Write a protein that binds this ligand. Sequence first.
Ligand code: PRO
Ligand code: PRO
Lengths: 203, 202
Amino acid sequence: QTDPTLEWFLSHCHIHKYPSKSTLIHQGEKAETLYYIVKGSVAVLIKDEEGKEMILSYLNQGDFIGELGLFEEGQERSAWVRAKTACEVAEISYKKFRQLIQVNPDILMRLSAQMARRLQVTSEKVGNLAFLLVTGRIAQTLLNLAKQPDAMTHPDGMQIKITRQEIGQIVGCSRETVGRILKMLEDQNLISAHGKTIVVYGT
Amino acid sequence: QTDPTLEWFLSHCHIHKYPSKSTLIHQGEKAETLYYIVKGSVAVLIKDEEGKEMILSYLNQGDFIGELGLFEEGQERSAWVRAKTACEVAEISYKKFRQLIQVNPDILMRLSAQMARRLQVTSEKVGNLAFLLVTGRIAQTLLNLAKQPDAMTHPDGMQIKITRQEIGQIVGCSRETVGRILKMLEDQNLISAHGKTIVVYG
Ligand code: PRO
Ligand code: PRO
């Protein structure tokens, strides 16, 4: 079971290998290139006002990078992209990709499908104004605990001792809701959680 | 002022009119369509825990519905779609649309642009801890104002009066951070903003 459409597309791309931690795309770069991840994983990241790194999302094999620029012709990169693992990345100009689409739209279907599957996950994960309020209070709770005397110093920030159940009691939501928000914050490079302890970054 | 490709796409569609509040796509519908709003607006809804109505998207003229199922045909989700206003919606089978894509990929491009903009909106929610707290305090401030006696009844919820500087001064953040948060809240379909006037939904 070969993939004729993919290898056709790939022959039109410049394929380069990036060691882990190397930067593929810099913030502010003119967006004129579409990327396809042949192998490996990347992190899409932005910075704080104090220059601390936050992860918008991870992109894996089969994902494209820079799809928005293909349609919106502004256009400067909003995010750095850095190799999470050693990766192989295919590169094509927007101009070349637009002519290929005309000839074989299956490759547009490929690009569209992987966006759609990424949209699906959050089709679920929603939350209203209340959930956003709860999120604020959880952050408040974590920030305040990291400031208190009984917080332990950690290479990545300040370590605090609190369960998800206790956060939920304070903030007025279920421990399941806390789990989801904590997992989100950990995915985003804002905290780490292990056992009953949480490391709040930057503090 | 002519869009021949759209006319071509629409000639392959069945166009239906829906009065406001009427359902377009029911819960658990096996996904095989592909909708295009010709006129008006719709709401995408889900029930939360216990069973209260919640908005996933407000979609307007030129927007697609059912575009995620195009790449996952047969999909059943718990969401449903309702007419916000009187609307006119073109529908087409995924099967037929796939035949059209080979001829002219332009409609798939418009659909994909919508999906790409949505991924970008989702990215703008991130999100440091201080930021998330400020966001919650801003939401809190708007929500409490909508509960006050001097709030006005609006079809979409409660209409309140407050400036961006007033919000910033109260909460303790820059005017730039207030703009960023209100925009985020509007993109999340939680409020609408028009000058001093803010409508808090629900
Ligand atoms: O379940 C509901 O609430 C909506 C009402 C119309 C059809 N589905
Ligand atoms: O160019 C195309 O592919 C179709 C033909 C008629 C309208 N647009």
